[PDB]
Design an enzyme around this catalytic site. Structure first.
Site, PDB file in Angstrom:
ATOM      1  N   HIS A 463       0.813  -1.171   0.000  1.00 45.45           N
ATOM      2  CA  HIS A 463       0.000   0.000   0.000  1.00 45.45           C
ATOM      3  C   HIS A 463       0.851   1.226   0.000  1.00 45.45           C
ATOM      4  O   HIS A 463       1.844   1.269   0.748  1.00 45.45           O
ATOM      5  CB  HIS A 463      -0.852   0.007   1.279  1.00 45.45           C
ATOM      6  CG  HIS A 463      -1.801   1.163   1.372  1.00 45.45           C
ATOM      7  ND1 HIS A 463      -2.768   1.409   0.422  1.00 45.45           N
ATOM      8  CD2 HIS A 463      -1.941   2.131   2.308  1.00 45.45           C
ATOM      9  CE1 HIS A 463      -3.459   2.483   0.764  1.00 45.45           C
ATOM     10  NE2 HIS A 463      -2.991   2.928   1.917  1.00 45.45           N
TER      11      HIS A 463
HETATM   12  C1  LIG Z   1       5.315   9.573   6.561  1.00 46.57           C
HETATM   13  C2  LIG Z   1       4.844   8.127   6.628  1.00 46.57           C
HETATM   14  C3  LIG Z   1       4.572   7.404   5.440  1.00 46.57           C
HETATM   15  C4  LIG Z   1       4.134   6.090   5.506  1.00 46.57           C
HETATM   16  N1  LIG Z   1       3.886   5.376   4.357  1.00 46.57           N
HETATM   17  C5  LIG Z   1       3.442   4.077   4.393  1.00 46.57           C
HETATM   18  C6  LIG Z   1       3.176   3.397   3.201  1.00 46.57           C
HETATM   19  O1  LIG Z   1       3.331   3.929   2.073  1.00 46.57           O
HETATM   20  N2  LIG Z   1       2.748   2.099   3.259  1.00 46.57           N
HETATM   21  C7  LIG Z   1       2.578   1.456   4.471  1.00 46.57           C
HETATM   22  O2  LIG Z   1       2.189   0.272   4.509  1.00 46.57           O
HETATM   23  N3  LIG Z   1       2.815   2.129   5.643  1.00 46.57           N
HETATM   24  C8  LIG Z   1       3.265   3.453   5.601  1.00 46.57           C
HETATM   25  N4  LIG Z   1       3.524   4.137   6.794  1.00 46.57           N
HETATM   26  C9  LIG Z   1       3.302   3.441   8.103  1.00 46.57           C
HETATM   27  C10 LIG Z   1       1.806   3.291   8.383  1.00 46.57           C
HETATM   28  O3  LIG Z   1       1.165   4.557   8.367  1.00 46.57           O
HETATM   29  C11 LIG Z   1       1.495   2.656   9.750  1.00 46.57           C
HETATM   30  O4  LIG Z   1       2.117   1.359   9.920  1.00 46.57           O
HETATM   31  C12 LIG Z   1      -0.050   2.664  10.000  1.00 46.57           C
HETATM   32  O5  LIG Z   1      -0.609   3.973   9.887  1.00 46.57           O
HETATM   33  C13 LIG Z   1      -0.457   1.960  11.324  1.00 46.57           C
HETATM   34  O6  LIG Z   1      -1.782   2.282  11.666  1.00 46.57           O
HETATM   35  P1  LIG Z   1      -2.375   2.214  13.151  1.00 46.57           P
HETATM   36  O7  LIG Z   1      -3.792   1.747  13.003  1.00 46.57           O
HETATM   37  O8  LIG Z   1      -1.459   1.308  13.950  1.00 46.57           O
HETATM   38  O9  LIG Z   1      -2.554   3.674  13.757  1.00 46.57           O
HETATM   39  P2  LIG Z   1      -2.675   4.993  12.859  1.00 46.57           P
HETATM   40  O10 LIG Z   1      -3.007   4.654  11.428  1.00 46.57           O
HETATM   41  O11 LIG Z   1      -1.378   5.772  13.037  1.00 46.57           O
HETATM   42  O12 LIG Z   1      -3.840   5.742  13.624  1.00 46.57           O
HETATM   43  C14 LIG Z   1      -3.670   5.897  15.005  1.00 46.57           C
HETATM   44  C15 LIG Z   1      -4.700   6.941  15.370  1.00 46.57           C
HETATM   45  O13 LIG Z   1      -4.743   7.093  16.780  1.00 46.57           O
HETATM   46  C16 LIG Z   1      -5.008   8.445  17.052  1.00 46.57           C
HETATM   47  N5  LIG Z   1      -4.684   8.622  18.482  1.00 46.57           N
HETATM   48  C17 LIG Z   1      -3.472   8.505  19.094  1.00 46.57           C
HETATM   49  N6  LIG Z   1      -3.681   8.703  20.421  1.00 46.57           N
HETATM   50  C18 LIG Z   1      -5.000   8.909  20.667  1.00 46.57           C
HETATM   51  C19 LIG Z   1      -5.742   9.149  21.828  1.00 46.57           C
HETATM   52  N7  LIG Z   1      -5.168   9.139  23.009  1.00 46.57           N
HETATM   53  N8  LIG Z   1      -7.103   9.344  21.771  1.00 46.57           N
HETATM   54  C20 LIG Z   1      -7.714   9.283  20.537  1.00 46.57           C
HETATM   55  N9  LIG Z   1      -6.985   9.049  19.377  1.00 46.57           N
HETATM   56  C21 LIG Z   1      -5.639   8.864  19.451  1.00 46.57           C
HETATM   57  C22 LIG Z   1      -4.172   9.190  16.045  1.00 46.57           C
HETATM   58  O14 LIG Z   1      -4.655  10.488  15.823  1.00 46.57           O
HETATM   59  C23 LIG Z   1      -4.252   8.282  14.814  1.00 46.57           C
HETATM   60  O15 LIG Z   1      -5.163   8.728  13.834  1.00 46.57           O
HETATM   61  C24 LIG Z   1       3.955   5.459   6.740  1.00 46.57           C
HETATM   62  C25 LIG Z   1       4.221   6.171   7.894  1.00 46.57           C
HETATM   63  C26 LIG Z   1       4.627   7.494   7.846  1.00 46.57           C
HETATM   64  C27 LIG Z   1       4.862   8.165   9.162  1.00 46.57           C
HETATM   65  N1  LIG Z   2       6.176   2.821   2.220  1.00 53.75           N
HETATM   66  C1  LIG Z   2       6.145   2.167   3.382  1.00 53.75           C
HETATM   67  O1  LIG Z   2       5.700   1.016   3.561  1.00 53.75           O
HETATM   68  C2  LIG Z   2       6.619   3.049   4.556  1.00 53.75           C
HETATM   69  C3  LIG Z   2       6.570   2.532   5.856  1.00 53.75           C
HETATM   70  N2  LIG Z   2       6.990   3.329   6.935  1.00 53.75           N
HETATM   71  C4  LIG Z   2       6.996   2.723   8.304  1.00 53.75           C
HETATM   72  O2  LIG Z   2       7.259   3.625   9.446  1.00 53.75           O
HETATM   73  C5  LIG Z   2       8.491   3.100  10.126  1.00 53.75           C
HETATM   74  C6  LIG Z   2       9.402   4.229  10.651  1.00 53.75           C
HETATM   75  O3  LIG Z   2       9.990   5.051   9.570  1.00 53.75           O
HETATM   76  P1  LIG Z   2      11.458   5.717   9.845  1.00 53.75           P
HETATM   77  O4  LIG Z   2      11.205   7.015  10.555  1.00 53.75           O
HETATM   78  O5  LIG Z   2      12.198   5.732   8.416  1.00 53.75           O
HETATM   79  O6  LIG Z   2      12.247   4.623  10.766  1.00 53.75           O
HETATM   80  P2  LIG Z   2      13.067   3.347  10.224  1.00 53.75           P
HETATM   81  O7  LIG Z   2      13.106   2.352  11.324  1.00 53.75           O
HETATM   82  O8  LIG Z   2      12.408   2.771   8.908  1.00 53.75           O
HETATM   83  O9  LIG Z   2      14.501   3.960   9.848  1.00 53.75           O
HETATM   84  C7  LIG Z   2      15.152   4.661  10.895  1.00 53.75           C
HETATM   85  C8  LIG Z   2      16.560   5.087  10.503  1.00 53.75           C
HETATM   86  O10 LIG Z   2      17.020   5.948  11.594  1.00 53.75           O
HETATM   87  C9  LIG Z   2      18.265   5.480  12.064  1.00 53.75           C
HETATM   88  N3  LIG Z   2      18.324   5.703  13.551  1.00 53.75           N
HETATM   89  C10 LIG Z   2      17.755   4.924  14.473  1.00 53.75           C
HETATM   90  N4  LIG Z   2      18.005   5.394  15.699  1.00 53.75           N
HETATM   91  C11 LIG Z   2      18.734   6.493  15.568  1.00 53.75           C
HETATM   92  C12 LIG Z   2      19.313   7.396  16.483  1.00 53.75           C
HETATM   93  N5  LIG Z   2      19.119   7.213  17.771  1.00 53.75           N
HETATM   94  N6  LIG Z   2      20.031   8.453  16.059  1.00 53.75           N
HETATM   95  C13 LIG Z   2      20.200   8.610  14.750  1.00 53.75           C
HETATM   96  N7  LIG Z   2      19.677   7.757  13.851  1.00 53.75           N
HETATM   97  C14 LIG Z   2      18.941   6.689  14.208  1.00 53.75           C
HETATM   98  C15 LIG Z   2      18.232   3.992  11.764  1.00 53.75           C
HETATM   99  O11 LIG Z   2      19.554   3.540  11.603  1.00 53.75           O
HETATM  100  P3  LIG Z   2      19.986   2.039  12.129  1.00 53.75           P
HETATM  101  O12 LIG Z   2      19.732   1.129  10.910  1.00 53.75           O
HETATM  102  O13 LIG Z   2      21.573   2.072  12.262  1.00 53.75           O
HETATM  103  O14 LIG Z   2      19.343   1.636  13.343  1.00 53.75           O
HETATM  104  C16 LIG Z   2      17.493   3.881  10.434  1.00 53.75           C
HETATM  105  O15 LIG Z   2      18.395   4.002   9.307  1.00 53.75           O
HETATM  106  C17 LIG Z   2       9.242   2.320   9.042  1.00 53.75           C
HETATM  107  O16 LIG Z   2      10.181   1.361   9.562  1.00 53.75           O
HETATM  108  C18 LIG Z   2       8.108   1.635   8.314  1.00 53.75           C
HETATM  109  O17 LIG Z   2       7.721   0.481   9.048  1.00 53.75           O
HETATM  110  C19 LIG Z   2       7.435   4.654   6.692  1.00 53.75           C
HETATM  111  C20 LIG Z   2       7.469   5.217   5.411  1.00 53.75           C
HETATM  112  C21 LIG Z   2       7.092   4.509   4.258  1.00 53.75           C
END
Ligand SMILES: Cc1cc2nc3c(=O)[nH]c(=O)nc-3n(C[C@H](O)[C@H](O)[C@H](O)COP(=O)(O)OP(=O)(O)OC[C@H]3O[C@@H](n4cnc5c(N)ncnc54)[C@H](O)[C@@H]3O)c2cc1C
Ligand SMILES: NC(=O)C1=CN([C@@H]2O[C@H](COP(=O)(O)OP(=O)(O)OC[C@H]3O[C@@H](n4cnc5c(N)ncnc54)[C@H](OP(=O)(O)O)[C@@H]3O)[C@@H](O)[C@H]2O)C=CC1
Ligand SMILES: Cc1cc2nc3c(=O)[nH]c(=O)nc-3n(C[C@H](O)[C@H](O)[C@H](O)COP(=O)(O)OP(=O)(O)OC[C@H]3O[C@@H](n4cnc5c(N)ncnc54)[C@H](O)[C@@H]3O)c2cc1C
Ligand SMILES: NC(=O)C1=CN([C@@H]2O[C@H](COP(=O)(O)OP(=O)(O)OC[C@H]3O[C@@H](n4cnc5c(N)ncnc54)[C@H](OP(=O)(O)O)[C@@H]3O)[C@@H](O)[C@H]2O)C=CC1
Ligand code: NA
Ligand code: NA
Ligand code: NA
Lengths: 490, 486
Positions: A463
């Site tokens: 996704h």
């Molecule tokens: C920049 C970025 C890009 C990403 N891209 C991808 C991608 O392309 N493909 C992919 O598979 N994954 C991607 N991820 C990771 C993915 O978004 C997460 O693994 C996913 O959203 C997990 O969903 P969740 O249900 O665990 O909680 P979330 O989807 O994060 O939702 C949690 C919800 O809880 C709410 N919340 C938190 N605390 C409280 C509270 N106390 N009371 C009420 N509400 C609260 C928040 O507002 C939030 O909406 C990306 C992540 C980031 C940060």
């Molecule tokens: N398209 C998708 O499916 C996407 C999924 N995500 C999800 O969200 C998760 C988190 O994203 P992201 O923020 O990139 O985290 P990640 O775990 O993916 O990558 C973190 C990077 O930060 C480095 N790092 C870790 N700890 C420290 C530290 N203390 N100081 C400096 N550098 C550090 C790590 O290095 P080291 O290897 O040496 O530990 C690693 O290279 C991802 O792992 C993924 O599961 C996010 C974006 C897109």
């Protein structure tokens, strides 16, 4: 010397199938192999050369051409994402495209040349192969069976892999028409062009011509019946028709050219069976391709043709003549490059290996590089429904979010899975939209592994993709019960 | 006060799947809690979750927008002429289109709630008052104005994760992915900090929209980015981002940041090096959002790593309290959270106790060029199987001999258990890789062997046909040792 040379295997036609056959026999099994083709590189006069239809006038260059054409779309749609440029400056330079296509093609020719000068027991012969007798292939200077002899090649086993050739209907002024062969070499993109046929080549070329047309240009595709792309998924046939139309191509259905004459200014004046008329600069016929048997002199050994025109073969590619085999388009089963390749490898393994192998013609993944492209594997629903009491169809068809921004709202991605509902077995998968051809390859492996709807469903999606639609479908949109279409089961 | 079969804290990818499934498949009475109804500051995530608001969805659009930098240049090779000096990348437009698309999703999620029976939404902050009670307060602070008291047979913790920020002086002058989504203008110079998903993806985004003269710097604390992914691919994607103008600083890590008089930021690395940038974006990990749940009132158990402890069924140490998605720290992916939610509600109110399979999950990095992968990398396979074989193809597709981007090698790797030919892992880099890999995930759930791939007939011409044309291993790991032959 002025002596004939002797081989374990002579292959006539150095194309997708023949090349795989030859190379395998030599490198894998240590056999002495000869390969014959009419031309060392691409283009007039014979179009196909070393490397076959695929490499020279087919798969490889059309795909580069379709790729060039997709930039029309990309350039426009970039605006939605913030890209600003001078729209008025934009030109599609065909000669540049065609020159780059030719350079790419020639490199492939040249590397083939390289290989045959290099590999032990794999020799290339330039000319026209025919069958003199059971164990003699003759190589002459032209297709005329009375042309001079360049070589006689003694063969224990002869493989026939001469492929196919465009079908031209016999109508008045057919000589003013071209086929795909000439299309690849046009000095200029046509301002107005008619692509005749509702199949692979017509629809792919229409897309090409449409992107590269000069200002005020128009592409028209005519099809003799009601809905193009017979054999493909019905939803998909109707959708690609909408999408082609949406991108500026006129689809004329229920129309067929009856005659063509030249106007005073040299452009082409088409008259349809219906009596309707159309003036274009180029008429490209794309109404089919036929096996190339005419020059082989099969009469001399008694190799039998099908009623249709292809060399008759058993599942193992063997003709009625013990040591003579045919593969690829010359058999007119499935006309695809990788099918031809598979047939070649299976033949060789069987003949020269210790263990027979047949090519599986069902569940063959394949594509249309239309704009937008199709990707398909397996049975369409109406065919399944004739063979299974219970058929489920899972359909997802929606404009992707990226295309509400890009401005191409008409770009619905379609994903359809066809099941035997009794047991869940996936019978066919049909896709339309960007990435369809790429998505579909692994689906090929799934169908081979006898995948079930619940196998796709249990798989966790990637996704955001288009592909994940294939892995989020648990409830059928409809069924066919005794070949009868219905929303629900009774 | 109000009574419910299921209360869901967090309206995200997992929360929403569970709640809806609970209401509409099982007819239960469900309440779902979230802090905000639409995207953006000040809580960023909202109805729809991280996915919709500040993750998958908007970033895939942004990356898509970034790809045009390549297409525009690449069209030339195929005969496209236009005035390349007229070409401007308008970030404000990208952002406004992105905002509009996300707003429509928030809107249609509201719609969904008004149209579904037994599914109720509560705006605010959710805490565990006690084993069977969820309070919703006005703000994240435990002494703010109680909005609601939800009585619950079952409680699903679905609060997701949050950007980790290192404790260095001037950390308050860095941003995360959250703020990245809302920048008024594209940064001229920017430091993406970290070697993972988010650093890499955003680097790609800033590299395309950067104003004239700009530079994207990605920094990673160790030798080679994207630890955990195939090794050839970590090397190649590095090379290819470099080829597109991204400076990759390896073995470097900010020790402090300060404000410059012009509003830009002065970064000091541990090594002593310095760099001035407009924006420093920390992308160094994401941590489980636990702190505002008041988990101490019930005594739900954490792990060392920080997330809620669960069994394979998503159940906490406390009987009727469950956690799914990013909060549990298993695999931070949206469709993993959707599957986790689904399985949990099938165990609980179904007859079908169901557990999510975290092995062989296909996923992608939306880098330019993108990555696609399913299953084991070779170094991990060699620790688990005596004999491991690696089939590899790597080369520039013919289209990129013409585009002039000669450096876009397409990489396809298949990692097997050489003993029985079982496919253990597939890894891809190149346009299409995230699409190509989806069905590959399906393959691995049918114990596909290397020969099934090879004896499948290719679709030609594709990159994907590469997977079905690899017959001979390139190399082997025997007992853990990489060798060419056996
Ligand atoms: C920049 C970025 C890009 C990403 N891209 C991808 C991608 O392309 N493909 C992919 O598979 N994954 C991607 N991820 C990771 C993915 O978004 C997460 O693994 C996913 O959203 C997990 O969903 P969740 O249900 O665990 O909680 P979330 O989807 O994060 O939702 C949690 C919800 O809880 C709410 N919340 C938190 N605390 C409280 C509270 N106390 N009371 C009420 N509400 C609260 C928040 O507002 C939030 O909406 C990306 C992540 C980031 C940060
Ligand atoms: N398209 C998708 O499916 C996407 C999924 N995500 C999800 O969200 C998760 C988190 O994203 P992201 O923020 O990139 O985290 P990640 O775990 O993916 O990558 C973190 C990077 O930060 C480095 N790092 C870790 N700890 C420290 C530290 N203390 N100081 C400096 N550098 C550090 C790590 O290095 P080291 O290897 O040496 O530990 C690693 O290279 C991802 O792992 C993924 O599961 C996010 C974006 C897109
Ligand atoms: C425009 C076009 C686009 C296509 N695109 C695709 C595609 O995208 N994907 C796909 O899978 N398939 C595509 N195809 C079909 C594909 O090219 C064929 O199925 C495949 O080429 C057949 O391989 P083959 O070995 O049977 O024959 P060929 O590749 O045609 O090889 C036959 C060779 O034999 C030579 N020959 C003929 N007669 C003689 C003679 N008597 N003596 C010596 N040599 C002789 C010819 O020169 C030719 O080189 C396309 C076809 C066309 C026409
Ligand atoms: N990307 C790929 O995989 C490609 C594959 N190919 C292969 O080459 C084969 C031939 O390509 P193509 O030439 O486009 O042929 P096709 O057989 O695919 O389609 C021919 C079209 O012409 C129509 N037609 C047939 N006969 C006549 C006639 N006498 N008068 C008017 N119209 C007629 C057919 O209509 P109807 O349905 O009524 O018979 C059909 O619409 C393809 O089938 C395919 O196997 C070619 C190009 C690309
Ligand atoms: Na799924
Ligand atoms: Na409701
Ligand atoms: Na194959």
């Amino acid at each position: 010397s002025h002596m004939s040379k002797a081989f374990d295997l002579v292959v006539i036609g150095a194309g997708s199938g023949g090349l795989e056959a030859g190379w395998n026999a030599a490198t894998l099994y240590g056999k002495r192999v000869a390969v014959v083709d009419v031309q060392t590189s691409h283009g007039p006069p014979f179009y196909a050369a070393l490397g076959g239809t695929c490499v020279n006038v087919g798969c490889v260059p059309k795909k580069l051409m379709v790729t060039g054409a997709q930039y029309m779309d990309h350039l426009r749609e970039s605006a939605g994402f913030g890209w600003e440029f001078d729209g008025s400056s934009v030109k599609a330079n065909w000669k540049k495209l065609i020159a780059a296509k030719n350079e790419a093609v020639l490199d492939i020719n040249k590397s083939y040349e390289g290989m045959f000068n290099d590999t032990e027991g794999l020799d290339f012969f330039l000319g026209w192969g025919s069958l003199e007798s059971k164990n003699v292939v003759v190589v002459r200077e032209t297709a005329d069976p009375k042309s001079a002899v360049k070589e006689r090649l003694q063969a224990d086993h002869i493989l026939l892999a001469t492929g196919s050739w465009p079908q031209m209907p016999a109508i008045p002024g057919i000589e003013h028409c071209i086929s795909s062969n000439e299309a690849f070499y046009l000095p200029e993109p046509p301002r107005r062009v008619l692509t005749v046929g509702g199949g692979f080549i017509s629809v792919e070329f229409a897309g090409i011509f449409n992107a590269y047309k000069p200002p005020g240009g128009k592409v028209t595709l005519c099809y003799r019946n009601n809905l193009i792309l017979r054999g493909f998924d019905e939803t998909i046939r109707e959708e690609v028709t909408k999408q082609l139309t949406a991108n500026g191509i006129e689809i004329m259905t229920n129309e067929n050219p009856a005659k063509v004459s030249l106007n005073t200014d040299g452009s082409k004046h088409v008259t349809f069976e219906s009596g309707k008329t159309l003036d274009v600069d180029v008429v490209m016929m794309a109404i089919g391709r036929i096996p190339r048997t005419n020059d082989l002199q099969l009469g001399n050994v008694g190799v039998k043709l099908t009623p249709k025109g292809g060399v008759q073969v058993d599942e193992f590619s063997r003709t009625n003549v013990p040591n003579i085999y045919a593969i690829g388009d010359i058999t007119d089963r499935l006309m695809l490059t990788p099918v031809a390749i598979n047939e070649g490898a299976a033949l060789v393994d069987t003949v020269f290996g210790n263990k027979p192998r047949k090519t599986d013609h069902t569940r063959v993944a394949s594509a249309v590089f239309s704009i937008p492209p199709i990707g398909t594997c397996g049975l369409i629903e109406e065919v399944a429904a004739k063979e299974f009491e219970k058929v489920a169809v899972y359909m997802s068809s929606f404009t992707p979010l990226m295309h509400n921004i890009s401005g191409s709202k008409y770009k619905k991605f379609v994903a359809k899975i066809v099941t035997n509902h009794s047991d869940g077995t996936v019978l066919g998968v049909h896709l339309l939209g960007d990435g369809a051809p790429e998505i579909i390859q692994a689906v090929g492996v799934c169908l081979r592994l006898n995948a079930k709807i619940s196998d796709f469903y249990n798989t966790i999606g990637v996704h955001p993709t288009s592909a994940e639609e294939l892995c989020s479908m648990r409830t059928p949109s409809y069924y066919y019960v005794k070949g009868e279409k219905m929303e629900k089961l009774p």
